[PDB]
Amino acid sequence: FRPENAIKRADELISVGEKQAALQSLHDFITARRIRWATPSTVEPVVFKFLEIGVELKKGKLLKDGLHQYKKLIQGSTEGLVSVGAVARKFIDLVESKIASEITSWLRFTWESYRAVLDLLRNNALLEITYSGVVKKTMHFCLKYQRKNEFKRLAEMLRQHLDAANYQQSKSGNNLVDLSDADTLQRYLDQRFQQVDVSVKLELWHEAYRSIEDVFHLMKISKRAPKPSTLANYYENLVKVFFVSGDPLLHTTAWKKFYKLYSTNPRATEEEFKTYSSTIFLSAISTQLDEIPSIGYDPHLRMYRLLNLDAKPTRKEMLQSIIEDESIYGKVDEELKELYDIIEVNFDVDTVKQQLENLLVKLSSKTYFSQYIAPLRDVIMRRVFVAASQKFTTVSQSELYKLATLPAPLDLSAWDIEKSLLQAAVEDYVSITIDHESAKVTFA
């Protein structure tokens, strides 16, 4: 019949308190078999009314069924797909106004709404823009309401979506997503870039880590480069991830990738180049000694390829690739260069406590130095134990342990020191026999 008549009958049915009968009346109209031929433009207002009522009554299933059934009828024309996307947007704007007005079941309703719209707009060339919009809105929603569980499921949904796109690539059907086109990719990559950001901000490190692989695969296929802003943010997220992760070589790498990209910004102060360069160098000195093959087991081995590295580097290699690169080594604080001399170049155990004692007063004031104190200490002490292994045959525990006591803030209690000595022995940086009877240590 007529849309005006439909709206009227709805408005009348709400006055009698038959709200559900009104929603159900509109559903019938817009999912009617005659809608396939109707002008999308002139039925869309009824779909809008259907959405208005459906949101108030929180009838999520009927809304979903309404949209899907309507789209199947209408998606034949270009104007049809346009109406679909427009009705998707209307739905989202309606529920998004309800969160503004409002509540637990309202958040879940909102999630289910975002989810439904995304699953409705999935893998359609004409709806790529609206979908990419809803993805961004959905990720902003999860971060804004710390909905970590739903976020994890969202991420999985986006993965399944892309898997279907890839399967459909070799099908040449109309209105199918073309993963060959850079604009399509620019959006998909932007979504995955944002997926990583929210992951990091919600401290879901396992999910952050999975999304790095998601992003990488899109960067591979992508011909067109991303915005240097959004890419710089990405690398800045990787520095966070790999620090939490305990992969220090990857951490330095993410920093270098970020430094190399930030040195091409017009608004980049010299004070920043000072502190960033310093951070990068310290984190490379602060890296665990790989001067001996690992125990060894490493579940993060695949990640080197994900950071575009052909293979796992050494700390010596990384540290040299930092010293040689003048763009970085140039703006590095002097204290760190001296440190590098003291620990890596000319290491003398008989003088290291002193060198460090004179250098740490200046180093402690540095902002970045605070967060690398532990691993650095570990490195220095490892070196001290190795060199001590070279210096003694049977040394008193008193002598050895005090000789391995760095100055603050690298200081350690005597028992934590023996603890380090044994760890070095387990990793075979030294073989020892400790006689607790005599309070002596023998390197045999």
Author numbering: 6 to 107, 151 to 492
Task: Quote the study that presented this structure, word for word.
Eukaryotic translation initiation requires the recruitment of the large, multiprotein eIF3 complex to the 40S ribosomal subunit. EIF3 is a large and structurally complex molecular assembly that, in the majority of eukaryotes, consists of 11–13 subunits (eIF3a-eIF3m) with a molecular weight of 600–800 kDa. We present X-ray structures of all major components of the minimal, six-subunit Saccharomyces cerevisiae eIF3 core. Yeast eIF3 engages 40S in a clamp-like manner, fully encircling 40S to position key initiation factors on opposite ends of the mRNA channel, providing a platform for the recruitment, assembly, and regulation of the translation initiation machinery.
The structure of the full-length PCI domain of eIF3a (S. cer. residues 1–496) was solved by single-wavelength anomalous dispersion (SAD) with selenomethionine (Se-Met)-labeled protein to a resolution of 3.3 Å. As observed in a truncated structure of eIF3a and in previously characterized PCI modules (Ellisdon and Stewart, 2012; Khoshnevis et al., 2014), the WHD is structurally similar to other PCI proteins, whereas the N-terminal domain has a series of distinct, flatly arranged helical repeats. The positioning of these helices is reminiscent of the concertina-like arrangement of tetratricopeptide repeats (TPR), although, as in other PCI proteins, TPR-like sequence elements are not detectable. Unlike other PCI HDs, which typically have a significant right-handed superhelical twist, eIF3a has two distinct segments to its repeat. Whereas helices 10–14 have a right-handed pitch, helices 1–9 are arranged along a flat plane that is distinct from other PCI proteins with extended helical repeats. PCI modules are characterized by an N-terminal helical domain (HD) and a C-terminal winged helix domain (WHD), which mediates PCI dimerization (Ellisdon et al., 2012).
